[PDB]
Amino acid sequence: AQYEDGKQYTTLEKPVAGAPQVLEFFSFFCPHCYQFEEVLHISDNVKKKLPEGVKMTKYHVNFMGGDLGKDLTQAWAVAMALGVEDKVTVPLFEGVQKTQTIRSASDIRDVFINAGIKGEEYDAAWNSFVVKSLVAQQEKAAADVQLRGVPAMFVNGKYQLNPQGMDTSNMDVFVQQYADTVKYLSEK
Template sequence: MNKFWLALIGLVLSYGVSAANYAEGTEFIKIEKAVQNAPRVVEFFSFYCPHCYQFESIYHVSQTVAKNLPKDIKMERYHVDFLGPLGAELTKAWTVAMVLKVEDKVSPLLFERIQKTESINTPPDIKGVFIKAGVKSEQYDAALNSFVVKSLVLKQQQAVEEFQLRRVPAIFVNGKYMIRNNGITIEDVNNYAKAYSDVVNFLISK
């Protein structure tokens, strides 16, 4: 059991509860002002955030939530600018990954090189990760400077403002519910991702 991670998210280790017992203020909160036209499920994260690194790479919450969603719903993942010296550049790079559909290849590499080896210090370092993931240099440059990437970057930045986001990782459902990362009740820490996913699916239909 990773005590460091438990300290960060404050997991509640207890007997599991049924969906009927999910309660506002425990597993989730209802935000004061609902965000119109938001994705049904959206996660905000940063490659500079150690919580986000463990959220994805150790406990696989992001992957589990996405995999267990109803077939007609896709989870969007938005990067935030407000952490780290290259926060804005990483948002652009993440958007390139979205457009080129290489998120699964790029995300682990970016997390590892920022969280573990601390080897990303310049925009060319970021580009190098894409090249290692199999993206050609000219393909990366073309996407980075494309209208669609610029539009999606703006969309992510606007969403951060609309949700009045101050910390990550954060997952919102239906534009009005936020999962409380430290409110998920579990018996075994290894079941955290599945329990988290169950709360998301409960809120989708709420």
């Protein structure tokens, strides 16, 4: 078969009941995740191959970056709560991995301020229980699949993308294979 379990994807031994349709995990510390966002634009190319309105979910993880990694999961919860993911993803990636100007929770806040989020608005969200709940959600989703590495994408809580089984000589061909595999899995 053109798509087969163990090749472009694997099948979770313990399916996760009631998981998002398309669930992506990343870390702002993760070098491949940097490539996935700035160079390959995986999330956008998956979205363009799914039916309009389909829910794509992207969550941050704690297991990279120690203390600052946990701060970044909370800041991503702030980003999701405020709807400003598209405003802070690039400057957070570049702050952690390119310029290395993000060394504290205050430096993370600076990124939001520079992106136009008001300080009182950021601080109110940071300390809110809605954000605490969004942190819990991100952690639970990762725990549900015993997540030990990123980037990762899961489809319907049953299938995990396997990008190691794809040619990488051409960046554009790899992206479309990835997105076509998500589409195929979403139609299973």
